[PDB]
Amino acid sequence: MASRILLNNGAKMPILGLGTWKSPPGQVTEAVKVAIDVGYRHIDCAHVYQNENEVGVAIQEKLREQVVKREELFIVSKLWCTYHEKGLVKGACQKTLSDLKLDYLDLYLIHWPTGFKPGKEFFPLDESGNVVPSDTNILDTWAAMEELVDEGLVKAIGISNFNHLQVEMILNKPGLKYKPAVNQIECHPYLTQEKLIQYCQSKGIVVTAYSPLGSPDRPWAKPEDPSLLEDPRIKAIAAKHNKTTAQVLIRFPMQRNLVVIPKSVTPERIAENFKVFDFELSSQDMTTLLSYNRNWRVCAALSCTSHKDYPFHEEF
Ligand SMILES: NC(=O)c1ccc[n+]([C@@H]2O[C@H](COP(=O)([O-])OP(=O)(O)OC[C@H]3O[C@@H](n4cnc5c(N)ncnc54)[C@H](OP(=O)(O)O)[C@@H]3O)[C@@H](O)[C@H]2O)c1
Ligand SMILES: O=C(O)COc1cc(F)ccc1C(=O)NCc1cccc([N+](=O)[O-])c1
Numbered sequence: 084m085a086s087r088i089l090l091n092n093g094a095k096m097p098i099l100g101l102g103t104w105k106s107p108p109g110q111v112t113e114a115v116k117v118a119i120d121v122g123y124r125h126i127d128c129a130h131v132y133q134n135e136n137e138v139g140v141a142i143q144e145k146l147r148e149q150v151v152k153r154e155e156l157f158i159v160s161k162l163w164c165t166y167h168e169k170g171l172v173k174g175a176c177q178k179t180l181s182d183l184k185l186d187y188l189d190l191y192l193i194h195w196p197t198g199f200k201p202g203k204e205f206f207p208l209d210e211s212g213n214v215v216p217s218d219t220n221i222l223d224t225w226a227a228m229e230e231l232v233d234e235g236l237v238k239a240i241g242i243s244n245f246n247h248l249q250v251e252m253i254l255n256k257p258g259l260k261y262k263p264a265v266n267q268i269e270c271h272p273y274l275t276q277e278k279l280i281q282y283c284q285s286k287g288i289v290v291t292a293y294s295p296l297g298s299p300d301r302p303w304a305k306p307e308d309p310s311l312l313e314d315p316r317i318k319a320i321a322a323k324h325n326k327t328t329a330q331v332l333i334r335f336p337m338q339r340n341l342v343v344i345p346k347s348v349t350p351e352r353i354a355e356n357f358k359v360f361d362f363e364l365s366s367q368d369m370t371t372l373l374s375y376n377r378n379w380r381v382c383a384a385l386s387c388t389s390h391k392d393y394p395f396h397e398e399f
């Protein structure tokens with residue numbers, strides 16, 4: 084399969100990237116170095132992950148070593164919720180650029196549609212534990228993102244965790260200058276996202292699947308929870324193809340025309356997870372994997388469920 088997908092800004096994006104949420108700061112530099120050595124050309128980052136400085140050390144060292152050229156890398160980061168204000172967006176992007184030791188990002192996403200009160204705390208709370216919103220709306224934040232393209236800080240802009248009505252709100256924005264290039268959403272066999280994916284693809288927006296292995300290291304995992312990597316039905320498809328369960332879980336979104344960003348800090352898994360370009364799942368395999376949907380969503384925050392822009396009350 085071709086390694087890159089064409090975005091609606093005219094640039095090509097590698098369909099396989101390395102995730103970095105939860106990658107410890109003392110391990111992520113070597114994880115990213117190994118990833119680049121074994122062929123990864125796309126790294127998914129965020130300020131809220133608190134490890135961009137260490138990701139940046141790896142990127143810079145591989146550029147200095149001339150393992151890769153900057154134009155061959157596709158570096159993604161995200162604007163955190165406490166920076167949705169007009170006057171804060173550029174500085175938030177600049178801090179990410181400084182930490183990653185880059186002069187531009189290939190793609191910068193609104194991380195969540197929910198804006199929060201600015202300040203030091205990433206989740207400002209009231210005394211009952213509700214997140215404290217900011218009055219900013221998704222359209223003014225979008226205008227601020229467009230300015231970053233026009234200032235040369237980012238080559239593409241997009242969104243993450245937007246439901247179809249929130250995507251539509253931007254597409255219908257008066258005076259829209261740049262369409263979102265990407266919507267990055269949770270997607271795996273237990274949360275297959277058909278409706279939102281078809282909506283986005285019909286509008287020319289590329290979808291990136293996050294948590295493709297079900298995020299088994301998420302901090303709120305419970306022992307009894309569903310496990311994609313241990314599902315015997317997925318293991319059987321993997322065995323039939325002489326691949327690992329993770330390799331099937333990564334190839335699955337690729338064949339839906341999605342980008343996919345599995346996370347690992349384990350060098351042998353980083354290399355394993357990249358070995359997915361030389362086998363195909365049949366149409367029957369694909370439909371069988373889709374049949375496992377249970378609307379099982381792993382990534383959301385209870386503190387945000389009354390925010391006016393909370394994305395997951397809508398069906399899709
Ligand atoms: N936009 C958003 O709101 C958002 C939300 C969630 C995630 N994301 C992005 O998506 C990335 C991926 O999602 P995620 O981190 O939630 O989880 P994930 O990629 O679904 O799963 C990561 C977990 O799978 C393990 N793993 C990786 N390869 C494996 C293999 N071959 N065999 C067995 N276990 C394997 C990792 O272990 P080891 O690391 O110990 O090897 C880790 O515990 C994130 O890191 C982040 O970049 C974005
Ligand atoms: O958001 C991510 O990329 C992964 O999840 C997190 C990563 C972090 F470093 C810290 C927190 C989270 C987390 O709780 N993420 C979930 C989340 C965030 C913001 C808004 C909402 N919401 O439901 O509106 C949900």
Ligand SMILES: O=C(O)COc1cc(F)ccc1C(=O)NCc1cccc([N+](=O)[O-])c1
Pocket residue numbers: 303380381382383384385386388
């Ligand atoms: O709520 C958070 O901040 C992170 O997510 C959890 C934290 C926990 F301590 C326990 C469970 C979760 C959890 O299930 N999170 C995923 C989730 C899916 C769908 C809806 C919600 N919600 O909060 O409305 C949350």
